Design a protein around this nucleic acid. Structure first.
Ligand SMILES: Nc1ncnc2c1ncn2[C@@H]1O[C@H](COP(=O)(O)OP(=O)(O)OP(=O)(O)O)[C@@H](O)[C@H]1O
Ligand SMILES: Nc1ncnc2c1ncn2[C@@H]1O[C@H](COP(=O)(O)OP(=O)(O)O)[C@@H](O)[C@H]1O
Ligand SMILES: [Mg+2]
Ligand SMILES: [Mg+2]
Ligand SMILES: [Zn+2]
Ligand SMILES: [Zn+2]
Ligand SMILES: [Zn+2]
Lengths: 409, 611, 308, 294, 101
DNA sequence: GCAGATATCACTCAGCACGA
DNA sequence: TCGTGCTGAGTGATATCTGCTTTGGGTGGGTGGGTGGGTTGAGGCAAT
């Protein structure tokens, strides 16, 4: 009942926002508006609501246009590659609804299994498939990685919710052999351009990073052993691969981009934690250089493309994308990267009354990031008149003026 | 800074909005009086107050989304002189601007006043303005092409209205693949349909379908208006003009009513055939209606209660009902008690008892009988002036017919049925075939008519009072012979009537002199009819007398005495009951006293006349 | 994309149907007992009192079902089916030798005891798709007809099968053949044997005479009865219907196989713009889908048994 | 830029050539010479002629569109289309040079506020009883009135209308199946209308009748209809002086009746039975075609 | 017999004596009824069946109804001297049909 | 000759892999 | 670290095509025309 009331209250707010765009009179009432642009020319826009608000008039003028630019989306079903429907291709929000009794039984069964024999099963499977790495077929790789990731995530959530349970039940997760196996599979997938297993390995790596961070936070003294494992998983080749992963993710499915966001956030958090705590050595690792490797145009393009679907997104994803935006904007002072136009349109769409819900948690982050970006952009534009044209086309790569273009000096 | 401008003109919409907001914010009725050269009529309470602010506050308290506007008020103000012409010449844009400004004014009033009223109700409510009194009333035969797309004022008689028609407002589309739902608006009767799904992940083209039962709808109705008979120049078929009314104005005017309508005189093409875009060169003309006008306060109640205290109220009302008729006080009194009527009784374990009084006015020809009939016909809210030999048995009760538009068997309402709750009037009762008179037997007894013929078996309520007149068989009334001989009509029928008066034109040197002096002055105050109608309506609606023991104790005596002297049947006792109840209604009493029943019996004996 | 609000309403309806109880002279589950009654006596319709709905869950469920009934109706049926599966599994399927005809039972939900009763003249377009009750006099009653509920077609090229096609208001045929190789797009044959049908009856009602204004033509309306509520209303008598106010389009314009397309003096022009309506316009007509009907007005042993 | 007809706000009409002018200057007038619907043949098509007859039907004024104005939601440009036929096809896509150079598919939408309209009336004219040959039935000719001449013709009137006799070519598929037969009409251009006191005004009620002086005085009083009808608070007193003339056959009653009844501007001579089937007062009859009591 | 709605074929429409099958029918003013209508209820009173042979509608319906009626005298009041048949314009058959007076 | 529903063909554009 | 030639893919405009009637009924007419066709029977009501 409470959930239904909340959903009805949200739908009522949406209806109220929609009502603002509808005319009191009927469709055939008539009424033509003539809006004159500064160059002494007037365009005719119909509709009663366009008469009072100029934004509605411009929006209707926009919508009346017929020609649409191409968008080609070549996507392959899981059945094509012989894989079953799973989190890889399902919607971010698709939830299987359970009755109280069935949900309780499912929780009890999963809890008993995790408390009983997850470690032994993982040990046996990882040893067997380390003996037989070569003949692995995509189905088995994806299934194993997904099982690992799901169980690690569930254990993490259970530990966070209550302290009665223990976090050592997934001890085999931190065991070296499993980590080497996962890294080898991910590297092979990247080399052979097998994107499905690549996505599965990305999810598994995200889960491993979450687990390592949580265990280090719980016990820092015993983390000295954990410090051994982190040194392995941040190899130069691995760092390059992780840096490149977001770059290619732009032209792929939404779930892949979500996994890219998750992995990038987790990697950045772990790297910051370890750099602050002690001297990170794989070659000493400084957070500045790894951060710089992550500031590139394709990364921002991928992030913008991800945030274009904010309507179907969750609060956590919005928070993470805006946290990364804040990092790029402030921590490294690379505002030139975010001085694009797609970001402006997206910000106005999300802050519009018909856009993201006003009484929502994410709107606070959106408003703060806007305020800051608008202030900095106004300052830069006042300083540099030429940026009035730079907002449209991509940044230059010319040595003579590249430095002035980016840093303004 | 693009400037919004109405198409084809040079009026800035922002100027219109600000001027209308200022006019609504600060307007006092004193300006209207000043404009009409009525300066000396300005008071200090009503004319010194913000009119439209009170109108909007009353709207909010009553939860309404309508504000009737007067153009002469716009002319009264200073900043809205040009707005009157703009409204007259470009009605659609100005009306939309006024609606939006009214909504903005309500929102600003709520926000600034810091009231506790929730903003949700006002935010989701559509507000509409209904201007009227926009100038002289044009004739239905004077609308030229020059007056297309301009605000006009019309008056006519409603002839026929179609049932409610649903008109789409917002369409609803659902993607067949991803089950994604979106709503799109309708402009100029065209759906702005999408080519492909608006979602990014799913872009399958031509996969969107219209869900008919989830689209928002509005109300539409089409009316036919016939010009008033007076406007007809040389006695031809009166012209007709079609009207369209939406939302609130639907089901506001019934068939056969005189209305004054303000709207836009629109024009629209007619397609030559169903399966082509081709259009006829001749355009159809019609009117888009924006306002319709069909042509008690505590102070009045305090005033009405003052009259009731007057000792000579009976004489005042009897003298005011028919001012012109001279020296017929008893006839007037009898007529008045019919308007008030008896008391209504709802009665299970039996049948309903209705307090309706029937009066017969039979007498010598030249006496004022038909004049009183017309006088009462004017006062009553409902009634049919049926005559003798001009009405039929079926015509009085009901006529079985068929509806061409619906092709279904329907029945019309006859003269008696059309008078439900009023007072029927008949002029020449004697000059009526007994076949038709037999219909009145059931009306006066059961207050209902039952019809069973040609597959229609139903009963129509005819709860109406009958007021008939008759003339003597001879050229005059002869006192020598008894009543049953002089007036005709079956003897039993005369017993049904509650009161049967007898007015005769005796010859005298003083009565004739006074009558002649009274009917020649045309070439003792009386209440204005407007107030009298309100008086009788209030008495008929609120008051409900209840008999007392003292009434019964002497009513039994009166009835038994009436029967002892001898025609006198139970109907006479029921008539006494009804008359006693009716007279109590006049004085606004909830209990019938001995005096009222004494007056009733006094009236009954002195009607037939106390030889 | 799933409808979160619909699923939440489904869960709330399931909980109400499961745990609701009313104190008797003992306390018993009214609706679980009713479901058991149907299971024993093989009934399709399950009657639900609206006052009980309003009482539970602060009335939010009642508001959701009443304000938007056409939207939420399928979810209510899903919840009812889930509850029936939980408690009376055998009721789901339709009821010397084996019988292969075991089709899914088409449950119907009937709502009654609405707090307010309307009139034919009070029907408005603002309340299309809302749960409301009306009263009227039955003037006509069409014969019982079978209505195509869920068709099943076979391709004319490869002889495939496409089943569970939903008909909205007209004869709807598939568009794309499920077989990847086949090129058929508009040639199909209806499998009249494997399809499913519902009983259908149209009833015309006019407003009661006393309610009418003096000297006014009564207003008529069309009412549709389905399932077990057929041949319940009879000509002449006065009945109280409860259901959902729907609007029926002019199916001829939408495109019907075989049929050709197509007071007010040309002012009754519909809405145009759809791809199906290349140049034609669609006009609407209000109707009423009724789920509940109420009639306002041998030997000795048989009568004695009825008497208590 | 815009079509010339759009800016025009005047109507041009032709006045026929009067007979006096033609005879003055030694010429023959064909236009003014009145004709009858019978004599209007196909040879006169496309000429200015005059027709004499009685109007038997008129229609309500309706706006006939002459120049339609459209507006492109993209350009801001207006497109004007001339219509000179009984039917036309609306424009869909903008033809402006802006929509051409950019090749934008802007949509044109009709705007009745900027179009041009002309008042239109359709009437019928029929032959008089003096022009129908024996054994023949009267014929009717349609008349079209445009511009300011509208409302100058009313039912039941004898007129001399001068106009252009033109055909009305069919359009669409109807043209192919209709054949070569042409439906014609008349475009009205000019319309010409064929238009002791007591004792003295008493002996002049019917000078021919000899006697009955007092009766004639009474009929004069009837003619005056002497009254000052008085209406007070509702009472109405009749203001009509009814009179009857009884007697024996031979005395001048019917002659007096028709004279007195012609004198007044309005009168109706009828027998005691009534005006044909309907008797004096009124009567309700079943409609032969609609079967509705009228 | 009235033509079928949306049909060219005739059909039988029930009447007062049909809707009152196995029931009581009430007539308020028997005398005022026309002679043509009075003879209509002659078969339904005794035979308890209605036979109509109108347009292509040959049928024999059943009306097992009890009819109760109220009538006024020939004049205004009941005449003591005159007999029952004298007071009422009803003839011998209808009076014989009636069970009680 | 004219409008509408339908299907055909040709042209041009965004991705891809390799070579510079 | 990156630039460009080849390819599959999908709309846009344009080619053929069917159709150009259609229909029972008097608020669709008779200057649209009968080679496009329309063939009741009971019951109610005014006149008398
Ligand atoms: N005083 C008179 N002066 C002139 N002619 C007269 C006079 N008296 C009678 N006539 C002639 O008497 C003839 C009588 O015919 P008329 O048409 O008047 O019939 P009527 O008897 O008056 O008519 P009805 O009886 O039908 O009302 C008329 O030709 C009239 O000219
Ligand atoms: N007492 C009276 N008061 C006023 N007018 C009277 C009176 N008596 C007679 N008249 C006049 O005499 C006329 C009688 O005509 P009318 O009332 O039509 O008589 P009836 O209707 O009885 O035939 C009326 O026009 C009225 O002006
Ligand atoms: Mg009179
Ligand atoms: Mg004569
Ligand atoms: Zn979609
Ligand atoms: Zn197939
Ligand atoms: Zn254009």
């Amino acid at each position: 009942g409470f959930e239904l009331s909340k959903l009805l209250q949200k739908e009522h707010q949406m209806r109220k926002n929609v009502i603002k765009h509808t005319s009191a009179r009927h469709s055939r009432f008539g009424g033509l508006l003539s809006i004159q642009t500064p160059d002494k020319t007037r365009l005719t826009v119909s509709g009663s609501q366009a008469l009072v608000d100029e934004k509605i008039a411009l929006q209707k003028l926009d919508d009346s246009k017929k020609w649409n630019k191409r968008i080609i989306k070549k996507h392959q079903s899981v059945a094509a590659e012989g894989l079953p429907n799973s989190l890889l291709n399902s919607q971010t929000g698709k939830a299987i609804f359970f009755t109280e009794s069935n949900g309780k039984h499912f929780k009890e069964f999963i809890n008993n299994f995790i408390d009983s024999g997850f470690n032994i099963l993982l040990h046996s499977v990882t040893n067997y498939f380390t003996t037989e790495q070569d003949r692995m077929v995509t189905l088995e790789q994806v299934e194993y990685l997904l099982f690992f990731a799901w169980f690690v995530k569930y254990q993490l959530l259970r530990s966070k919710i209550d302290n009665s349970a223990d976090i050592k039940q997934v001890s085999e997760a931190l065991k070296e052999v499993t980590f080497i196996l996962v890294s080898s599979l991910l590297r092979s997938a990247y080399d052979l351009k097998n994107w499905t297993v690549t996505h599965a390995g990305m999810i598994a790596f995200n889960e491993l990073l979450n687990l390592v961070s949580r265990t280090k936070a719980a016990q820092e003294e015993d983390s000295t052993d954990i410090e051994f494992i982190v040194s392995r998983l941040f190899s130069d080749e691995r760092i390059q691969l992780l840096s490149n992963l977001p770059k290619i993710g732009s032209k792929y499915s939404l779930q892949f981009m979500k996994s890219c966001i998750e992995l990038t956030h987790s990697v950045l958090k772990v790297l910051e934690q370890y750099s602050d705590d002690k001297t990170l050595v794989i070659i000493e690792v400084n957070f500045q250089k790894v951060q710089a490797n992550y500031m590139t145009e394709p990364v921002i393009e991928t992030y913008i493309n991800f945030l274009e679907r904010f309507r179907e997104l969750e609060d956590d994803s919005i928070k993470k994308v805006f946290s990364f935006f804040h990092r790029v904007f402030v921590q490294a002072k690379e505002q030139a990267l975010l001085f694009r136009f797609d970001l402006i349109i997206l910000l106005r769409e999300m802050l519009s009354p018909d856009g993201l819900d006003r009484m929502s948690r994410s709107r606070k982050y959106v408003s703060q990031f806007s305020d800051y970006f608008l202030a900095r952009l106004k300052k830069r534009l006042k300083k540099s008149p030429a940026w009035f044209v730079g907002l449209l086309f991509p940044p230059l790569h010319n040595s003579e003026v590249g430095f002035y273009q980016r840093y303004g000096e | 800074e693009p400037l919004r401008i109405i198409w084809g003109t040079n009026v800035s919409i922002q100027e219109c909005t600000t001027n209308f907001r200022n006019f609504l914010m600060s307007f006092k009725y004193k300006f209207r009086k000043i404009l009409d050269e009525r300066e000396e009529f300005i008071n200090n309470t009503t004319d010194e107050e913000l009119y439209y602010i009170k109108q909007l506050n009353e709207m909010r308290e009553l939860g309404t989304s309508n504000l009737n506007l007067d153009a002469r008020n716009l002319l009264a103000y200073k900043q809205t002189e040009d707005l009157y012409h703009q409204l007259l010449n470009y009605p659609q844009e100005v009306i939309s601007i006024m609606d939006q400004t009214i909504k903005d004014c309500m929102v600003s009033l709520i926000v600034d006043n810091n009231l506790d009223y929730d903003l949700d109700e006002i935010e989701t409510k559509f507000y509409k303005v209904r201007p009227y009194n926009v100038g002289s009333c044009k004739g239905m035969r004077e609308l030229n092409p020059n007056d297309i797309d301009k605000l006009i004022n019309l008056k006519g008689l409603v002839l026929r209205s179609t049932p409610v028609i649903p008109d789409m407002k917002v369409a609803f589309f659902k993607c067949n693949v991803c089950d994604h739902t979106m709503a799109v608006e309708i402009d100029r009767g065209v759906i702005q349909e999408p080519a492909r799904c608006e979602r990014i992940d799913c872009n399958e083209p031509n996969s969107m379908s219209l869900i008919h039962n989830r689209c928002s709808f509005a109300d539409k109705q089409v009316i036919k208006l016939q010009e008033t008979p007076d406007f007809v120049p040389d006695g031809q078929t009166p012209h007709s003009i079609s009207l369209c009314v939406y939302d609130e104005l639907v089901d506001s005017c019934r068939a056969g009513d005189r209305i004054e309508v303000t709207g836009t005189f629109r024009s629209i093409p007619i397609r030559a055939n169903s399966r082509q875009r081709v259009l006829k060169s001749l355009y159809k003309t019609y009117v888009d209606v924006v306002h319709v006008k069909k042509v008690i306060t505590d102070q009045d109640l305090a005033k009405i209660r003052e009259v009731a205290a007057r000792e000579d109220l009976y004489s005042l009302l009897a003298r005011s009902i028919a001012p012109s008729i001279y020296e017929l006080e008893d006839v007037k009194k009898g007529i008045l008690l019919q308007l008030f009527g008896g008391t209504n009784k709802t009665f299970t374990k039996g049948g309903r008892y209705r307090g309706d009084i029937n009066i017969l006015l039979c007498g010598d020809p030249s006496t004022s009988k038909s004049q009183i009939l017309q006088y009462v016909h004017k006062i009553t809210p409902r009634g049919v002036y049926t005559s003798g030999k001009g009405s039929s048995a079926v015509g009085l009760t009901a006529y079985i017919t068929r509806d061409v538009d619906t092709k279904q068997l329907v029945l019309e309402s006859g003269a008696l049925v059309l008078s439900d709750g009023g007072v029927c009037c008949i002029d020449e009762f004697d000059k009526m075939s007994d076949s038709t008179r037999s219909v009145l037997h059931e009306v006066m007894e059961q207050q209902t008519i039952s019809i069973a013929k040609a597959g229609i078996i139903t009963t129509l309520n005819a709860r109406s009072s009958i007021l008939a007149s008759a003339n003597p068989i001879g050229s005059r009334y002869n006192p020598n012979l008894p009543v049953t001989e002089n007036i005709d009509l079956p003897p039993p029928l005369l017993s049904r009537f509650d009161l049967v008066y007898l007015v005769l034109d005796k010859v005298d040197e003083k009565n004739d002199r006074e009558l002649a002096k009274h009917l020649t002055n045309l070439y003792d105050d009386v209440l204005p009819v407007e107030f009298l109608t309100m008086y009788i309506s209030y008495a008929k609606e609120h008051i409900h007398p209840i008999i007392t023991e003292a009434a019964k104790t002497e009513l039994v005596r009166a009835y038994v005495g009436m029967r002892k002297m001898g025609t006198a049947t139970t109907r006479q006792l029921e008539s006494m009951i009804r008359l006693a109840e009716a007279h109590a209604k006049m004085k606004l009493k909830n209990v019938v006293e001995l005096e009222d029943v004494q007056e009733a019996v006094r009236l009954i004996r002195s009607a037939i006349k106390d030889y | 994309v799933d409808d979160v609000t619909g699923e939440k309403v489904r869960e709330a309806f399931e909980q109400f149907l499961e745990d609701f109880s009313v104190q008797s002279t003992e306390v018993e589950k009214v609706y679980r007992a009713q479901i058991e009654f149907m299971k024993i006596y093989d009934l399709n319709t399950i009657y639900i009192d609206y006052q009980h709905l309003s009482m539970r869950e602060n009335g939010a469920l009642a508001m959701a079902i009443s304000e938007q009934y056409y939207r939420f109706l399928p979810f209510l049926q899903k919840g009812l089916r889930r509850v029936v599966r939980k408690y009376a599994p055998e009721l789901l399927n339709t009821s010397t030798s084996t019988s292969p005809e075991q089709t899914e039972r088409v449950f119907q939900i009937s709502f009654f005891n609405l707090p307010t009763v309307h009139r034919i003249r009070d029907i408005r377009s603002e309340k299309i798709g809302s749960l409301l009750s009306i009263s009227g006099t039955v003037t006509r009653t069409s014969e019982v007809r079978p209505e195509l509920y869920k068709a099943s077609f076979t391709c004319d090229m490869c002889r495939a099968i496409v089943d569970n096609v939903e008909q909205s208001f007209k004869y709807t045929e598939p568009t794309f053949c499920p077989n990847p190789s086949c090129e058929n797009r508009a040639f199909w044959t209806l499998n009249v044997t494997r399809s499913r049908f519902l009983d259908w009856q149209k009833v015309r009602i006019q407003e009661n005479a006393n309610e009418i204004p003096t000297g006014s033509m009564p207003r008529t309306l069309d009412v549709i009865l389905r399932g077990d509520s057929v041949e319940r209303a009879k000509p002449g008598d006065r009945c109280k219907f409860t259901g959902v106010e729907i609007v029926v389009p002019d199916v001829t314009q939408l495109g019907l196989p075989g049929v050709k397309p197509s007071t007010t003096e040309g002012l009754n022009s519909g809405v145009t713009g759809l791809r199906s309506l290349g140049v034609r316009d669609l006009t609407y007509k209000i109707s009423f889908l009724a789920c509940h009907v109420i009639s306002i007005g041998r030997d000795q042993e048989v009568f004695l048994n009825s008497l208590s | 830029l815009f079509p010339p007809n759009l800016t025009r706000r005047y109507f041009l009409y032709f006045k026929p050539l009067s007979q006096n002018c033609a005879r003055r200057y030694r010429k023959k007038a064909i236009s003014s010479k009145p004709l009858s619907v019978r004599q209007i043949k196909g040879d006169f098509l496309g000429q200015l002629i005059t027709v004499r007859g009685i109007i038997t039907r008129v229609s309500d004024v309706k706006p006939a569109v002459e120049v339609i104005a459209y507006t492109c939601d993209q350009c801001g440009y207006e497109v004007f289309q001339e219509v000179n036929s009984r039917t036309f096809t609306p424009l869909s896509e903008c033809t402006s040079e802006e929509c051409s150079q950019n090749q934008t598919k802007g949509q044109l939408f009709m705007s009745t506020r900027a179009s041009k309209f002309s008042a239109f009336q359709e009437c019928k004219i029929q032959e008089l009883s003096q022009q129908v040959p024996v054994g023949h039935i009267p014929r009717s000719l349609n008349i079209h009135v445009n511009g300011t001449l509208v409302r100058s013709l009313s039912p039941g009137d004898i007129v001399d209308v001068t106009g252009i006799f033109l055909p009305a070519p069919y359009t669409g598929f109807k043209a192919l199946k209709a054949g070569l037969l042409t439906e014609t009409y008349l475009e009205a251009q000019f319309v010409r209308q064929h238009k002791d006191v007591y004792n003295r005004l008493a002996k002049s009620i019917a000078p021919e009748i000899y006697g009955n002086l007092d009766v004639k005085k009474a009929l004069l009083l009837l003619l005056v209809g002497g009254v000052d009808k008085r209406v007070g608070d509702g009472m109405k007193i009749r203001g009509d002086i009814n009179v009857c003339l009884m007697g024996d056959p031979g005395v001048a009653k019917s002659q007096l009746l028709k004279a007195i009844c012609k004198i007044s501007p309005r009168g109706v001579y009828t027998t005691g039975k009534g005006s044909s089937g309907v008797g004096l007062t009124a009567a309700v009859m079943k409609d032969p075609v609609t079967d509705e009591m009228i | 017999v009235v033509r079928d709605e949306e049909g060219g074929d005739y059909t039988i429409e029930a009447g007062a004596l049909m809707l009152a099958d196995n029931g009581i029918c009430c007539i308020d003013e028997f005398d005022k009824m026309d002679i043509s209508d009075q003879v209509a209820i002659h078969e339904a009173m005794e035979q308890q069946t209605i036979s109509i042979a109108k347009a292509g509608i040959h049928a024999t319906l059943n009306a097992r109804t009890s009819i109760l009626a109220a009538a006024n005298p020939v004049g205004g009041r009941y005449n003591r001297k005159l007999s029952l048949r004298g007071n009422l314009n009803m003839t011998a058959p209808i009076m014989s049909r009636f069970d009680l007076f």
